[PDB]
Amino acid sequence: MSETIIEKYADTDALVTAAGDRLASAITGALAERGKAMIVLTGGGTGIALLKHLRDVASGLDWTNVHVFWGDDRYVPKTDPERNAWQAWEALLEHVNFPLRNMHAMPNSESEYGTDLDAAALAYEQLLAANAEPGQDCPAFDVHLLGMGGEGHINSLFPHTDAVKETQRLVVAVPDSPKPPPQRITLTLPAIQRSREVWLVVSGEAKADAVAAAVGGADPVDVPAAGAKGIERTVWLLDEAAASQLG
Ligand code: NA
Numbered sequence: 001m002s003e004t005i006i007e008k009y010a011d012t013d014a015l016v017t018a019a020g021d022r023l024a025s026a027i028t029g030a031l032a033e034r035g036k037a038m039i040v041l042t043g044g045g046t047g048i049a050l051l052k053h054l055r056d057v058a059s060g061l062d063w064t065n066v067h068v069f070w071g072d073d074r075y076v077p078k079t080d081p082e083r084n085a086w087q088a089w090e091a092l093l094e095h096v097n098f099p100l101r102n103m104h105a106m107p108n109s110e111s112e113y114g115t116d117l118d119a120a121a122l123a124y125e126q127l128l129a130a131n132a133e134p135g136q137d138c139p140a141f142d143v144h145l146l147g148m149g150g151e152g153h154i155n156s157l158f159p160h161t162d163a164v165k166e167t168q169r170l171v172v173a174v175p176d177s178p179k180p181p182p183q184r185i186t187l188t189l190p191a192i193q194r195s196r197e198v199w200l201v202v203s204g205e206a207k208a209d210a211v212a213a214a215v216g217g218a219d220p221v222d223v224p225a226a227g228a229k230g231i232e233r234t235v236w237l238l239d240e241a242a243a244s245q246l247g
Pocket residue numbers: 035064065066
């Protein structure tokens with residue numbers, strides 16, 4: 001029943017600027033109203049580009065009031081180039097005074113869960129509950145950022161998978177992603193749906209069919225992005241290419 005907003009920008013650069021400015025404003029707003037912002041970060045070129053923009057325009061925010069979580073990450077070493085958290089570190093977090101006690105990265109392959117990816121996912125579920133309000137099992141994320149693949153995948157939720165079918169668990173292990181690397185930890189649709197707002201930031205014609213399918217009410221098991229819905233609103237931030245199958 002929540003509101004849906006679709007914004008279209010000329011190209012990837014205009015999209016990233018607009019999305020990064022929207023994020024700066026959303027963080028400022030949450031700090032002004034509650035003295036706290038809870039943001040779920042994503043990986044991917046566009047998602048990281050948005051963080052580089054935030055560094056450019058909002059380095060002066062009070063980061064001690066900003067708390068960051070991840071929607072997914074790759075089960076590889078901490079400083080591996082394929083880590084979403086390390087990419088956000090290099091794009092933004094290492095360049096500001098951001099206390100590490102506020103940073104909540106997912107486990108990596110050196111975290112001593114070893115081959116037990118499911119235990120690693122349980123651990124992140126425990127972290128979500130510890131950082132939630134009393135009696136809640138997940139923070140009320142102010143914004144969950146998302147990228148989307150050409151098949152509509154979001155976080156590491158792929159079509160026709162157990163992860164996208166999960167209705168109870170908030171975090172699960174993915175042993176078999178068809179996009180490299182195969183092993184990830186991911187927030188599920190129920191976790192995404194704890195967010196006040198979910199923003200999908202999407203660029204390129206290769207994604208236009210999936211965007212249209214998702215806006216057009218596909219089953220999330222067929223097109224995972226269709227399940228990515230905020231409590232207050234869902235926001236599609238597109239370039240014209242990614243929007244080219246919408247009206
Ligand atoms: Na604080």
